[PDB]
Symmetry: C3
Subunit: 349 residues, 3 copies
């Protein structure tokens, strides 16, 4: 199965080599296309040529790539076209041990499989407190009735703590229960000029301390905090004090867009417009998956199938670009163009 | 023309293989260098060797790469050196169908061409409201004379709305006319403690609602908003209220640095110092383009030419690094070194 | 030495090709494995097969890759296993000019060497003022005794300046002495509604100006400032004024995670869990370096060795993934699983 994907990838990248009619192929390419096209035409009864010239030949080669991409991805598109009919036998073609795959394709699939099947630490994209319902004006005093220290969130990545003169307390629980961090990177600062409940300015005297797990931490320096050890603020000062604690970034085992090299650039390639046919085809193929059909996902995918499908579709887009096929898709209605940003934008519903 | 670029790229990457004198080449490399160097020396009358040993031979091979890079990029450098003279006939060398190009180079050019010639949605880099002339203190009440609800910008990615008791209104126009978003991702929060015009604190009672296109949206959860549907805030409460609405990120059809895999790393490679000669050469080549000559652009390039030139120049930098040529550039004056960060920094004007 | 790394890389990527038992290899792969395995078995006395089937054969091939990775990285792991013993003679294998390296591996090493040995401008990751001990409430007036203009930091990427009616002054020193910027990209805004020391709101009248090096700059537009030229604010207005100046991003010669294509994805791959053996092995290998052993570094590495080791280890992880070896590491105790996120997370101390 990983070999099946490695083969489809190998064949599609080889076809993207056919930029022109009379060019001379690197030997490696002809050896692969030869075997692949022969197995394919045999089990399918299509008549793909190794060096396409006419539009009909280009379409036919492109359809071979489409078949291979769908079979490796495990998708069955359904009747999307009067010109193309998916050949389920392609899976047999791709499982033939005689079709070789390249070192690049092999290594790329090993990556998809290796990272996708495990977990590892990664810098998450958004603010640690992005999913909060309430926020407090930054730098304005606020103490909850009966407490001497009150921590409150003032930004998507920030909290501020108000301390009564001489007060001390633990502040960690404000950070708990959200996300599932492995490490939280903090930097704390003295809020030098803040607003009192009444509206008048007040200063924070030097002398306030923040300690993590009992050890004293300087202000304005990154702190690696495990999220468990006690986060203790102490105002030894004889006046009210305010400190801000910023979560500069945190790491968890949720997958990000950096799980696979240049995943973002691949996703971008897949969701580009190109023209109405690609747009229609891409949409139709993605409808058979858990991926959005015309706009990049909000959260990065995290399973083998989604990642594979994106990689496979990105390569197919490149093949589309070099073969320039022309065929019909149900419900798609072409505009001669010559195609503009306005026209592209309108196609996204 | 895409083939021309694929060939230049193929040849340059092959030359970067010549790390040492006695190593044995992968066959594929010798087959390519053989043909390429032969066509080149023939139409040019230079005498490039396949396995350079002396400095003179290394310079000569490097000049062949420089010629190929300039011809594929469509640039004419002019008289930048007493040691090197660009050979315009190189275009004829690169258009020879007998020089093969690799699957990697072919696929890379297909990408540059495919993405560059169309449009597609992409997460933009900066705050949705980065280009605003005025900003309002966050969490401080502000109502425009005669209105019951007043929306105002309080950050590069943020707006806050002040609502009179019982008030309701549409807030979308504050977001309109800037950028050309396809989707805006929002999260709204109740500002739990804010400043009244006088300076005294006030609370926002639970009960405030935000609705998009008529449907009710919870606070602290990402909302996919098309930017057209009505953004309606309602304060059913008997006291003043404040809500913050954060644009966590938005997508448009403007090109970002993720349009091509690892574009940033390529750009970084091109603008690195290396030494005075590379610095001088790179600057001279970039002067013939719309790209800045010594500092990475502020906004990502978006046309085929710029992208190609960056990719081609990045590869040439790698060749420079392995061939270690030594030649003179007009106006450049070498410092033996051994080269430091201070010296590098000073070279950037 | 660069050739040594290019060879280890070439061999390891070839081994990741051995996905299954009966598949047919691309010729290029067999030519390389043949020579490499022969030199290796000869100088080492191990008996690696070219097409491993049993677990014992897979372990043996994996150990060959481990030896090659350690020798190219210059690491000596020590006695980490009763099943594996590092063979120092591997360096002799890798220095044999008859083992060929691929164009990909060669080009990848040229990059590591080229960028690592020089300096170049790069957009830094965090806020320009991330390392500040004190911060001032945003949008609240504050004037230092005896001055007419007072600049103060109000965010990790922001400063605000309070101007008395008719006042003018230079503001650049607030930006100096921190980081070592080559260029700072600014955008200034009028704070339209701010808090006076007493708590009452005040407006900033239009008419305030910001000029860089004597030239007038509009508000809400990015400004490329060298950090040296005078940053002059002028309030020609007859009332107090406040302006915010945002450092949207800056560039310096400190290395970022974009110094090498998809460095982040490689780092992610290396620090992924996989299973207890990989986790143990990776930790043991990283203990011999300046890199953290189980969590990605906070600051990007900047020397050849670290970068190389990461690249080499990432590839070895892929080999691990395809060969699926099974051996013992001192102090590591396997859990049959089938392995979950909870179990993975617990392994990170």
């Amino acid at each position: 199965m990983d070999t099946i994907a490695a083969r489809a990838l190998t064949v599609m990248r080889a076809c993207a080599t056919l930029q022109e009619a009379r060019i001379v192929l690197e030997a490696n390419v002809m050896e692969i296309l030869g075997i692949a096209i022969n197995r394919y035409n045999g089990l399918t009864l299509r008549g793909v040529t190794m060096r396409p010239t006419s539009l009909a030949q280009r379409n036919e080669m492109f359809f071979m790539c489409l078949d291979m991409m769908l079979s490796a991805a495990g998708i069955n598109v359904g009747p999307i076209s009067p010109d193309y009919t998916q050949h389920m036998a392609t899976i047999g073609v791709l499982a033939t041990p005689e079709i070789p795959f390249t070192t690049e394709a092999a290594n790329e699939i090993a990556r998809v499989t290796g990272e996708t099947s495990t977990w590892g630490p990664a810098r998450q994209p958004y603010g640690f407190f992005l999913e909060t319902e309430e926020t407090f004006q930054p730098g304005r005093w606020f103490m909850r009735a009966a407490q001497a220290v009150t921590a409150v969130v003032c930004g998507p990545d920030m909290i501020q703590v108000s301390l009564n003169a001489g007060a001390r307390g633990d502040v960690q629980q404000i950070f708990q229960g959200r996300n599932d961090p492995m490490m939280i990177y903090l930097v704390w600062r003295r809020i030098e000029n803040f607003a009192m409940a009444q509206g008048n300015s007040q200063q924070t005297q030097a002398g306030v301390t923040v300690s993590v797990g009992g050890v004293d931490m300087r202000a304005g320096r990154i702190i690696a905090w495990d999220g468990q050890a006690a986060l203790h603020v102490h105002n030894p000062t004889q006046q009210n004090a305010m400190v801000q604690i910023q979560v500069v970034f945190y790491i968890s085992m949720d997958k990000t867009l950096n799980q696979y090299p240049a995943l973002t650039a691949e996703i971008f390639n897949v969701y580009s417009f190109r023209d109405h046919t690609w747009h229609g085809l891409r949409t139709a193929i993605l409808n058979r998956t858990t991926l959005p059909n015309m706009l990049p996902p909000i959260f990065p995918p995290n399973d083998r199938d989604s990642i594979l499908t994106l990689l496979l579709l990105s390569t197919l887009a490149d093949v589309y670009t070099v073969l320039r096929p022309e065929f019909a898709i149900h419900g798609v209605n072409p505009m001669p163009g010559p195609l503009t940003r306005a026209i592209a934008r309108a196609a996204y519903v």
